[PDB]
Amino acid sequence: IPAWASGNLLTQAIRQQYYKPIDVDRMYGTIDSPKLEELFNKS
Amino acid sequence: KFTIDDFDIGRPLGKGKFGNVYLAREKQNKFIMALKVLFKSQLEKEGVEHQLRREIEIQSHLRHPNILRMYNYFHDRKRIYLMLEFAPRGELYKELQKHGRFDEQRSATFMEELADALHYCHERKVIHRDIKPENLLMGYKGELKIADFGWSVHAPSLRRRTMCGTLDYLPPEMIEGKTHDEKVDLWCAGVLCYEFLVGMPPFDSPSHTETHRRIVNVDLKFPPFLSDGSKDLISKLLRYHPPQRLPLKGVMEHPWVKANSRRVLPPVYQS
Ligand SMILES: CCN(CCO)CCCOc1ccc2c(Nc3cc(CC(=O)Nc4cccc(F)c4)n[nH]3)ncnc2c1
């Protein structure tokens, strides 16, 4: 389990993220998605 | 766009009917999320592609503070990956089992959150159909997150016939083979509120026949420790007749909810 992913390093990062939320609609909701029709076809 | 190589993988968080969930960090943004990993050949052999598709379609288009977010999704040669909100306090069911029962503040809070999330769903003609503790997660400040949409449906016009959900939560109309509508979620909310307060669901029996009998008779037996307000809300949700159940706005306005809820909305991104 890498360091970031447990104990206080995790706790602090989570707190941080709660109080400084990022723009997920832009950072992720803006990026292309595979067509649902295509999820079981070739990548 | 996304590949698995864009994420640091932390550790596993849970199972799932189709696959494993991992704690993950998107490297670019150092943003902590969860990644649900599904194997394509397993899904095809189980025959569940269409079912998985419909679940993704519903969850990926809902944005509410009490519904677990699906940020995006991607796939490679062998796997499909769902990018999900991380719920730092984890499974609600584990918390109920540890405490036995929740107090009135914690219960009322959760009810206000549930009702707000469900009303968001219903305004979009989405029926959930399997509200229960095991389908709920908790955020950083304990906030309810509806996590699992496995039985959910978009039902813009037609009544439904599918028997679905979980034994102790089934509404009468399901058991009786009637058509159903969004008002099934009202009934399940009522069962949930009782289970939060009592630690067992209201119709618990060792035989499926007896549980079904108790449900269709609405054989509700309130323990004496329950407050009058809590009983009043549960009683108004657990109506035999769907049209007589308290609406979700009615749950959010109920005096027991107003008096006891300590709901806080999470901070949101600011320009
Ligand atoms: C108090 C600290 N605890 C200690 C744990 O050792 C809890 C730490 C956090 O625990 C969890 C557990 C499960 C999680 C979890 N589980 C999860 C997410 C989902 C949504 C899901 O899988 N969506 C989905 C959508 C379409 C198709 C499909 F197959 C699935 N279901 N279950 N998601 C996010 N964070 C979680 C945090």
Residue numbers in the entry:
A (entry chain D): 798 to 840
B (entry chain A): 87 to 357
What wording appears in the published article?
Mammalian cells possess three Aurora kinase isoforms (Aurora A, B and C) that exhibit different subcellular localizations and have distinct functional roles. The most conserved C-terminal region of INCENP (the so-called IN-box) is sufficient to bind and stimulate the catalytic activity of Aurora B. The CPC complex is involved in numerous mitotic functions, and the timing and mechanisms of each of these events are carefully regulated by its localization within mitosis.
In this context, we sought to investigate this inhibition mechanism at the atomic level. We determined the crystal structure of the X. laevis Aurora B–INCENP complex at 1.5 Å resolution, highlighting the binding of the active form of barasertib to the ATP active site. The binding properties of this inhibitor to the Aurora B active site are analyzed and reported. Of the many Aurora B inhibitors that have been reported in the literature, in recombinant enzyme assays barasertib shows a higher selectivity, with more than a 1000-fold greater potency, for Aurora B than for Aurora A, with IC50 values of 1 nM and 1.4 µM, respectively. Consistent with the inhibition of Aurora B kinase, the addition of barasertib to tumour cells in vitro induces chromosome misalignment, prevents cell division and consequently reduces cell viability and induces apoptosis. The structure of the kinase domain was not perturbed and it adopts a highly similar overall conformation to the previous published structures of the catalytic domain both alone and in complex with small-molecule inhibitors.
